[PDB]
Ligand binder design. Structure first.
Ligand SMILES: O=C(O)C1=C[C@H](O)[C@H](O)[C@H](O[C@H]2[C@H](O)[C@H](O)[C@H](O[C@H]3[C@H](O)[C@H](O)[C@H](O[C@H]4[C@H](O)[C@H](O)[C@H](O)O[C@@H]4C(=O)O)O[C@@H]3C(=O)O)O[C@@H]2C(=O)O)O1
Ligand SMILES: [Ca+2]
Lengths: 284, 363, 492, 283, 363
């Protein structure tokens, strides 16, 4: 019919699409059948075994906690950094800030971890030294379960916040000046502007970026945690993704792990559905 | 709220460039004055200097007695309508208008009344709760104007309000603007690259070129008696012809151009142009007719037809005279048929001459 | 050709050996090259040299569907037995009887050792690391710091508290700063050994957290009520900054850092290697004198030395079912129990680190006078590594200094050294219980203890929940199995 | 933003803004200049009170240690390989793939789009991916690393978006001249797409260079190890041979100084190319 | 070459929606025909269907005797000039021009004559070696046309070519197109949203409102006798005034307007009028005059002056009659004062009448 004609016409172009489709089927969609297998069959029990663990339930309890902190402190920061750079005159000064603020993004996560362990080491690490300078004594940071999350979210904003600020910055740069100039004729003030124009105009961008941010919300800090979590911090640091890793790959317990992975994935899809709904609905 | 703005030797300088050269213009109260010229002249830069959106690098401008140079736009008693869509996409039309007033608030009643007025003027009442997302470009510009008239300024500042509009909308909006000036009567400076809006809307037209100010006068002054060759080529619906010519035998009588043609001249005393003088002879397409002007008492021009573009009840005839072509506006048809010879009859009273070196008005 | 060749045609085998969370086998090792020369057998390592945890890597190898020809490392004994019973490892019994005269003879002269490495099925699935010696670890303190501060060596726990407090407080290192760290160790577990001063065992043997026997009853030192009262005090010592804050982390570099940097005041470690530092760093730390002390009288009025050199450490190597040359490999393994094999696996390589003198192996002067301990030097070369081999105490005697030797004799004469726990014989059924719960229980215990030491958790408050956790995690089940193994054998 | 200065409520605000942003910038630039100095300083200096910012006792010694490390340069080589060839494979799978996805004459335009995009919000999870890597025979294999992660949904829809943004009149004119499909893609649409190409090759590049987890999971042979893995061993775990303990005393560098030198040698190529990268996008 | 394109019942359907309904047009060889209409329309889709960039879902279209319905655009023997200029911003200008012919045919194609011609036509000597990233949009479109004219096809296809160009440039290029078609003469179909270009360039105009085809005929045919109210309001430089009207007492004699006004009507033939009939009275701005100069009587009308916009030697007068306003073209620069009443003399011959429902021309 139409199809064959097109195809007869949409081939050379139809050829290109195939390997990408072959790839997605093999490395992405083929593993979902594995989802189905590791899910001698049954099953649904080790789900109730996974239900009861004193280490696990605290890992989800830690997961959504860390999600809370990352949403509170982590997310709004690149927007803040975005607005603050846009308020900068002086040309190159601003440029100088950007290259400074963007750079940490390119620093590897494991290197970030190393920077952390070398900075926070007692009697050696510069931070503790600076504390000894003003008479704050010393703290062994990575062992203390009290300090884990602050160290983490802080190091994370240091690494990713500028690069994440780039997008929002571009968005606010795309607003036609007329809104600002006409606002200035009525005598708006910079703060009045960012509240009454820049932010509301940039909202669709921050809402779209938030529903992606929520998509990964349960996996937050995986490589960091998997790198730096000590026995004493096992309690506060251990998160669902990490638990899955430890039992599934390290501990070589697959079925129970893959199942935990399902729990995580389904909850993530649910939270991104509930995100996209309220987002698209309420923000445009 | 009817006030006079005088601009004295105002100059803008960006870095080393000096955009505007010390433009000076005085504007009477209640007057509608249009800055017009090509792109890159200080039209917008001057207007914005008035607004306070750009610093004045030299000279002073003042509204009434107040010298507004060091003042702020908020306090300058001005309102500006911009070129592109100054409304905020999230706010409703009512909130868009009331925005400036809600900056300081001070009551919802006062601003309610003001909005009532403005909406009544632009017919924005049914559009109040609607959103910029869905509105006509013209409607957007109307509410944008509502922003301005709700401020109740001494001066209305217009920067190419109609540029992004389609032509059909532009003529209408132009009419609406004139009507509006009748209704309100507030002093207004209006900036355009379009000769038409200038000729129609303006009480006084000031044409500017490359940072300088080429001429000032009523529309018909600029049209009938352009200071130079540029102003001649600029205003008017088609361009004025302006082809190079000379003088020869005698002076105040005959002028000859490249086509082996000679045109006798009406005296116009006070002219005093020299024989042989390098000159450019202008004539407007409406001031040239076909052979129906009966025998050319003064022995008018000769030309060969290039093309004919039929338009309305009129038609645009392109004829060539020597190395150059003149465009004459004739009736709304006729055989013509490009490629055959044709005799044109020039109106002697409407001819304009300009010197080659000094581009000034001469005849 | 060589007389010690186990094969005419050269044979290359795949070995997975990742041990002590530090080293992997290197076929480019001088000792490995020498072993290949003499045995005509080259061992090529398949392991990640980037890996950290060795146990982890073993577990991953076993689950990867492919096994090498030989598997080796430290603390694999229980795993050797388990996976041997499951068929991952081949029984070496017939191979030893027919093809391995040296090992056979060794086991005949050492029925206890052979018994120790045997599985419940009566099979030997691996050839063990066999240590040679008597004493292992002893207490060492800085005599020069005692003399500079005009202090006498502590005879008791209270006196040692006071001495370590003096170390902590006023400038024993004389730099005008408070930077000094009184107690350091390359082994984190040694911090737990401090409970000895309060009358608690941290172990029943050289193996850390091992079980012990008291009056015909099997106990684990960490599950006892005395351990709580001791740990309270050790947590106090950490809190007062007497114990190195990094003790659970610093590990293998500890001495070199703390003694080399003149920070460390006290330790508990092996006699020889600890005494080597006196000669080594004497130029960098001019006044450094580290001397052996008898254990101080503890709170129970006794002198305890909990550690001793053991017989048959739970280390060694085994032959997989995927190995296509079991005979050649068992001959090869038997090489290390012969004289030349012991010579290379103990002294490194001839003409390099040692020479033959009067029929015995004598270290080069270049090795003996090196600031680095001889055994470390040997590790880096592929010698003194936990393959199946027979250790020779002479190798250690050569670098053992007179002060060290006198420390050893001091500990021997005083009978301070506690009797070591050799083991019990489980059947196939009960050992399954042991193997199921023990590793995880031990891990939990370690985590808890580390939490207590660093003061992140109060020992007293958490003790009850800790005991409950021990029961629910299957410790006591294992304990009854251990007991049922014990009471059958020993009666009168 | 706003050009003409004026109000106090602005001026003060702007100054405190520049100051806050300045302090933040300094905090963010601090760890980079620290370890650079710290790498250069002397073990004894770093071990107690010194450094804090500038070098102190120099001696330059740790760098030798890293320079004579064979696994370090081996791993660096591995990463250069993985970034270059990984990027190329990603491009060859994406750029044409998104190009087809852009033209809405495709039947599968609706369904293929869903196929690709759906992977964003749902994943089979860690273990299933690893196992599918296992039975595909790609474990401990470089090509397994290259082909394992090439296509991302994000880079695809982004590429197809920049393609779609271009007016169809170019392709139409090309067809008018006889040029068919692929030969259009290379001749016109690709040189028109340079910015998107840039953002893509950049994102993929950094993804390969800084990649850690799946490399250390999927790789066994040490000679295949890509930097950040090996880096994980030396820079974070921080437990070492008696060998390194013995190298410590005969040298006068420190553990910390060696770590510093290592992370420096790790970040140098990134600090170099970075202005070039930024200069492009920062026009 | 000089070829004839016939289009018979051509229809394309998107989904279940039919874009063009049974469009049929026969185009003479060497004839310049213009498609024109509103924004969304099947002019671009028809042109595209000729080009072959869109498939023919129904009806047949052929060039000469060759049926092009199922064919390759390359083999369609057509050339197309895009609105977006569709030029590769990589290759040289000369390389862009020679591109189509350089796929095959080097060495005995020689390529030089054609590019010589096309170079002289658009008059580019220096622009031979350049890049599209450099040259201006006007020159970009010039060389774009160069690609087409160097192809030597049977038919030229233009889809809104100068749409993205500025007005001053648009007019120039328009003239250049006229002249070009006179010089070369290949058959050309030309799509526009702008009435002016249709009037000027077309031998025949065909106006298409969305869906079907509204009208066909010479420019003056569409100007003099509109098929409906739409063709009337669409064509002409200002809009034709259209106001509601009626008949009453007698038919062929009088037609009445809103406020106090009636116009005597010229009877003619084929009218078929009727009394009381709801009707819209059209009249062009040029077809209304001031008060009468000559005159007079029953051809007049009474209004009140709303506003007057001077253009030049001409002036646009907005006159209010009833609640509706009509626009007259004044020979002004004379003086008229807003707010006072004025008389307008309508040309009785040029009036147009359309039924209110049928919306088609009765008169
Ligand atoms: O120091 C000497 O003088 C000395 C002389 C002897 O000739 C002999 O070579 C002896 O070798 C000792 C060495 O000195 C260390 O004390 C070494 O410590 C080992 C310990 O024996 C355990 O094997 C420990 O196993 C760890 C394992 O490495 C993992 O970390 C795992 O997670 O936990 C287990 C554990 O249960 O602790 O590793 C220690 C280590 O390598 O540091 O023991 C040898 C020895 O031969 O026993 O030294
Ligand atoms: Ca000190």
């Amino acid at each position: 019919e139409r199809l064959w004609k097109d195809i007869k016409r949409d081939w050379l172009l139809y050829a290109m699409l195939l390997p990408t489709i072959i790839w997605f089927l093999i490395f992405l969609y083929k593993p979902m059948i594995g989802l189905q297998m590791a899910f001698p069959w049954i099953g649904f029990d080790h789900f109730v075994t996974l239900f009861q663990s004193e280490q696990f339930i605290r890992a989800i309890k830690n997961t959504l906690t860390l999600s809370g902190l990352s949403l509170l402190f982590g997310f709004p920061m690149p927007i803040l950094l975005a607005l603050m750079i846009n308020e900068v005159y002086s040309k190159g000064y601003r440029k100088a800030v950007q290259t400074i603020v963007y750079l940490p993004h390119f620093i590897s996560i494991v290197i970030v971890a190393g920077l952390v362990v070398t900075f926070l080491s007692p009697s050696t690490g510069v931070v503790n030294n600076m504390l000894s300078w003003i008479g704050l004594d010393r703290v062994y940071f990575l062992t203390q379960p009290e300090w884990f999350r602050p160290i983490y979210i802080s190091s994370n904003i240091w690494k990713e916040a500028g690069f994440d600020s780039i997008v929002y910055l571009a968005a606010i740069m795309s607003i036609n000046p007329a809104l600002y100039e006409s606002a200035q004729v009525d005598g708006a003030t910079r703060w009045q502007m960012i509240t009454r124009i820049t932010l509301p105009c940039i909202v669709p961008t921050i809402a779209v970026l938030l529903v992606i941010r929520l998509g990964h919300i349960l996996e937050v800090g995986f490589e960091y945690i998997i790198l730096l979590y000590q026995p004493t911090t096992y309690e506060t640091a251990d998160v669902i993704s990490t638990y899955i890793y430890r039992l599934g790959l390290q501990g070589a317990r697959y079925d129970i792990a893959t199942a935990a992975g399902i729990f995580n994935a389904v909850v993530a899809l649910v939270i991104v559905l509930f995100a996209n709904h309220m987002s698209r609905r309420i923000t445009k | 709220m009817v006030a006079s703005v005088s601009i004295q030797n105002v100059v803008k300088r960006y870095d080393k460039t000096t955009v505007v050269h010390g433009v000076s213009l005085d504007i009477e109260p209640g007057e509608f004055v249009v800055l017009v010229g090509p792109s890159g002249c200080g039209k917008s830069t001057t207007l914005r200097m008035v607004a306070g959106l750009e610093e004045i690098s030299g000279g002073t401008i003042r509204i009434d007695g107040r010298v507004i140079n060091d003042l702020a736009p908020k306090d300058r008693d001005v309102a500006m309508v911009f070129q592109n869509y100054a409304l905020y996409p999230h706010l409703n039309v009512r909130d868009n208008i009331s925005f400036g007033l809600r900056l300081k608030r001070t009551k919802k009643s006062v601003i309610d009344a003001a909005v009532k007025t403005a909406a009544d003027i632009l017919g924005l009442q049914p559009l109040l709760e609607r959103k910029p997302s869905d509105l006509s470009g013209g409607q957007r510009q109307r509410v944008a104007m509502g922003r301005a008239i709700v401020r109740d300024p001494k001066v209305f500042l217009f920067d190419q309000p109609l540029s992004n509009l389609d032509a059909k909308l532009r003529t209408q909006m132009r009419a609406e603007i004139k009507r509006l000036h009748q209704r309100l009567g507030t002093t207004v400076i209006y900036v355009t690259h379009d000769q038409v809006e200038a000729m129609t809307l303006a009480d006084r037209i000031v044409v500017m070129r490359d940072g300088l100010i080429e001429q000032i006068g009523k529309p018909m002054d600029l049209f009938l008696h352009p200071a130079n060759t540029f102003v001649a080529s600029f205003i008017g619906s088609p361009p004025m012809n302006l082809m190079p010519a000379r003088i020869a035998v005698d002076s105040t009588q005959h002028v000859e151009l490249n086509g082996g043609n000679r045109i006798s001249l009406l005296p116009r005393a006070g002219t005093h142009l020299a024989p042989g003088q390098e000159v450019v002879f202008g004539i407007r397409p409406e001031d040239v007719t076909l052979d129906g002007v009966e025998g050319s008492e003064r022995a008018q021009i000769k030309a060969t037809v290039d093309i004919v573009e039929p338009l309305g009840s009129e038609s645009i005839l392109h004829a060539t005279v020597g190395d150059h072509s003149l465009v004459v506006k004739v009736g709304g048809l006729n055989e013509v048929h490009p490629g055959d010879p044709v005799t044109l009859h020039v109106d002697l009273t409407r001819v304009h001459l300009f010197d080659a070196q000094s581009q000034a008005s001469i005849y | 050709k060589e007389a010690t060749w186990v094969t005419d045609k050269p044979l290359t085998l795949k070995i997975h050996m990742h041990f002590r969370d530090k080293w992997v086998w290197d076929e480019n090792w001088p000792v490995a090259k020498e072993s290949f020369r003499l045995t005509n057998v080259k061992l090529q390592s398949v392991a990640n040299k980037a890996a950290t945890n060795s146990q982890e890597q073993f577990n991953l190898m076993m689950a990867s569907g492919d096994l090498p020809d030989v598997v080796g490392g430290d603390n694999l004994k229980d795993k050797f037995i388990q996976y041997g019973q499951e068929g991952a490892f081949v029984p070496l019994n017939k191979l030893i009887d027919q093809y391995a005269p040296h090992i056979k003879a060794f086991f005949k002269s050492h029925p206890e050792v052979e018994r120790a490495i045997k599985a419940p099925d009566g099979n030997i699935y691996f050839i063990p690391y066999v240590p040679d010696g008597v004493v292992a670890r002893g207490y060492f303190i800085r005599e020069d710091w005692l003399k500079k501060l005009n202090l006498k060596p502590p005879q008791n726990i209270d006196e040692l508290y006071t001495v370590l407090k003096a170390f902590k407080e006023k400038d024993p290192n004389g730099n005008g700063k408070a930077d000094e760290v009184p107690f350091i160790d390359r082994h984190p577990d040694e911090v737990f050994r401090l409970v000895n001063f309060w009358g608690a065992r941290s172990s029943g043997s050289d193996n850390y957290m091992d079980f012990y026997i008291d009056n015909g009853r099997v106990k684990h030192p960490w599950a006892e009520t005395a351990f709580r009262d001791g740990m309270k005090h050790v947590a106090q010592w950490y809190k007062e900054g007497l114990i190195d804050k990094e003790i659970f982390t610093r590990k293998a570099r500890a001495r070199e850092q703390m003694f080399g940097g003149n920070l460390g005041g006290f330790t508990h470690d092996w006699f020889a290697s600890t005494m080597t530092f006196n000669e080594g760093l004497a130029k960098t730390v001019p006044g450094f004198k580290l001397i052996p002390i008898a254990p101080p009288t503890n709170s129970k009025g006794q002198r305890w030395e909990e550690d001793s050199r053991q017989k048959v450490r739970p280390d060694g190597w085994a032959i997989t079912v995927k190995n296509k040359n079991p005979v050649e490999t068992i001959k090869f393994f038997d090489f290390y129990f012969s004289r030349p094999g012991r010579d290379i696996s103990n002294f490194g390589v001839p003409g390099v680190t040692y020479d033959i003198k009067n029929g015995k192996a004598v270290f080069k002067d270049s090795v003996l006078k090196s600031p680095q301990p001889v055994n470390n030097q040997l590790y880096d070369m592929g010698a003194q590594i936990p393959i199946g081999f027979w250790q020779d105490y002479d190798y250690e005697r050569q670098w053992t200094t007179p002060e060290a030797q006198a420390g050893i004799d001091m500990y021997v004469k005083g009978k301070y050294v506690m009797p070591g726990f050799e083991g019990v014989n489980m059947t196939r059924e009960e050992r399954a219980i042991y193997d199921k719960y023990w590793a995880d229980v031990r891990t939990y215990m370690y985590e808890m203890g580390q939490a207590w030491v660093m003061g992140t958790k109060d020992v007293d408050k958490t003790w009850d929940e800790y005991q409950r956790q021990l029961k629910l995690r299957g410790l006591y089940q294992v304990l009854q199995m251990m007991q049922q193994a014990y009471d059958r054998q020993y009666k009168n | 933003l706003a050009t003409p200065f004026y109000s106090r409520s602005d001026r003060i605000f702007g100054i405190v803004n520049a100051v806050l942003l300045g302090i933040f910038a300094l905090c963010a630039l601090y760890p980079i200049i620290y370890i650079f100095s710290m790498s250069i300083s002397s073990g004894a200096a770093v071990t107690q009170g010194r450094v804090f910012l500038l070098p102190v006792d120099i001696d330059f010694s740790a760098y030798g240690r890293v320079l004579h490390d064979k696994l370090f340069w081996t791993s660096y080589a591995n990463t250069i390989f993985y970034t270059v060839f990984g990027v190329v494979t990603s491009l060859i799978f994406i750029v044409p793939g998104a190009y087809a996805l852009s033209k809405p004459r495709i039947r599968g335009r609706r369904v293929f789009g869903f196929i690709i995009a759906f992977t964003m919000w749902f994943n089979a999870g860690m273990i299933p991916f690893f196992l599918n890597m296992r039975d595909l025979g790609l474990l401990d294999n470089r090509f397994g690393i290259l082909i394992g992660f090439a296509c991302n949904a994000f880079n695809i829809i982004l590429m197809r978006n920049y393609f779609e943004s271009i007016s169809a009149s170019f392709e139409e004119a090309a067809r008018m001249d006889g040029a068919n499909d692929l030969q259009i893609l290379w001749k016109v649409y690709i040189p028109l797409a340079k910015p998107a190409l840039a953002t893509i090759t950049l994102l993929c590049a950094i993804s390969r260079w800084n990649g850690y987890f799946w490399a250390m999971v999927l790789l066994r042979a040490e000679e295949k190890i890509p930097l950040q893995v090996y880096l994980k061993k030396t820079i974070v775990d921080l437990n070492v041979n008696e060998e390194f303990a013995g190298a410590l005393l005969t040298n006068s560098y420190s553990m910390e100084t060696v770590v510093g030198a290592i992370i420096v040698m790790s970040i140098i190529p990134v600090i170099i190319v970075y202005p070039v990268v930024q200069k492009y996008f920062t026009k």
